[PDB]
Amino acid sequence: DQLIASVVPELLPSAELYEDPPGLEPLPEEEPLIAKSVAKRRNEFITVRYCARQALSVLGIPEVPILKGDKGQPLWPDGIVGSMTHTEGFRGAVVGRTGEVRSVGIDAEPHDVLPNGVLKSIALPVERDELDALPAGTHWDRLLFCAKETTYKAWFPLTARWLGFEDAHITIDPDGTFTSRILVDGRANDGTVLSAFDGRWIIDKGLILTAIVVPKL
Ligand SMILES: CCNC(=N)NC(=O)Nc1c(CC)cccc1CC
Ligand SMILES: [Mn+2]
Ligand SMILES: [Mn+2]
């Protein structure tokens, strides 16, 4: 019944918590990253890393700090890829080994309409027309935004480059899948070319969860 486990393969352990349990602490090496942060930010940072460390233990990796790189990206141990996300009512993480998968991204959002003006900032004109044609009963605008965030999180670890909202065209299928088509240069750091990603999505517990796994070559 866990949301991340429903949209990623069994080979990628995941862990999620819906509240901030009492008594958690960051590892000493992580404390400087949130020393001057408000309580809401300290709590999501600490709880998501407790989830990541649980998933890393399933891979046989013991307790390790998860620091942030120059573009805010989490810095995983050698031979590990992963992703983390937090929203009100959700903290989650997923990790995998580089010999099984190339990259993973996840994102969680509340299942509600986007705030005013956000859809115009994140969607291509063609995506807006596509969302209007989808069946009634799902907040397609919020699902599109969620899928764009997951696209960036799967892309950045492979390219080390920015990806704007206008740089990817996402097509959502009501069956719980989506595709992301990259509209800019897709040269990856390993010499290969990224052009498209396949994603999965689920709506449950008032939340939307999207995931992309970039598979082994
Ligand atoms: C496909 C285009 N999507 C993105 N480029 N998305 C992000 O940059 N998202 C983001 C933002 C901007 C909303 C701020 C802080 C941290 C992150 C990284 C998860
Ligand atoms: Mn967050
Ligand atoms: Mn997010």
Which of ligand 1's atoms lies nearest the C-alpha of 151? 1
Ion ligand 3 nearby residues (CB, 5 A): 107, 149
* Cβ–ligand 1 contact at 144 (below 6 Å): no
* Cβ–ligand 1 contact at 210 (below 6 Å): no
Which of ligand 1's atoms lies nearest the C-alpha of 148? 1
Residue showing tokens 């939307």: 208
DSSP element (H, E) containing 150: helix 140-159
* Cβ–ligand 1 contact at 148 (below 6 Å): yes
d(CA 134, CA 123): 15
CB 7 within 8 A of CB 201: yes
Q: How many CB atoms lie within 10 A of CB 52?
A: 25
CB 144 within 8 A of CB 100: no
3-class SS of residue 96: strand
d(CA 64, CA 124): 40
Residue 113 half-sphere exposure toward CB, CA atoms < 13 A: 5
Sheet holding 90-97, edge to edge: 14-17, 90-97, 80-87
Choose which residue among 83, 152, 162, 184 to substitute to test ligand 1 binding: the one with the highest number of ligand atoms within 8 A of its C-beta: 152
Q: Obtained via which technique? A: X-ray
Residue showing tokens 């959502």: 172
Structure-token pair, residue 24: 């958690």
DSSP secondary structure letters along 51-87: HHHHHHHHTT-------B-TTS-B-PPTTEEEEEEEE
CB 208 within 8 A of CB 109: yes
d(CA 118, CA 115): 6
Phi first, then psi: what are they for 30, rounded to 5°? Answer: -85, -25
Gap from CA of 152 to ligand 1 centroid (Å): 7
Gap from CA of 139 to ligand 2 centroid (Å): 19
CB 89 within 8 A of CB 205: yes
Contacts of 75 (CB under 8 A, 6+ apart): 66, 67, 68, 69
Name the amino acid, one letter, at 43.
N
Choose which residue among 149, 162, 184 to substitute to test ligand 1 binding: the one with the highest number of ligand atoms within 8 A of its C-beta: 149
CB 194 within 8 A of CB 186: yes
36 labeled binding residue: no
CB 20 within 8 A of CB 12: no
CB 145 within 8 A of CB 180: no
* Cβ–ligand 1 contact at 165 (below 6 Å): yes
- The resolution of the experimental structure, rounded to one decimal in Å, is 1.4
* Cβ–ligand 1 contact at 140 (below 6 Å): no
d(CA 194, CA 111): 30
DSSP secondary structure letters along 155-217: HHHHH-S---GGGEEEEEETTTEEEEEE-S--B-TTS-B--EEEEEEEEETTEEEEEEEEE--
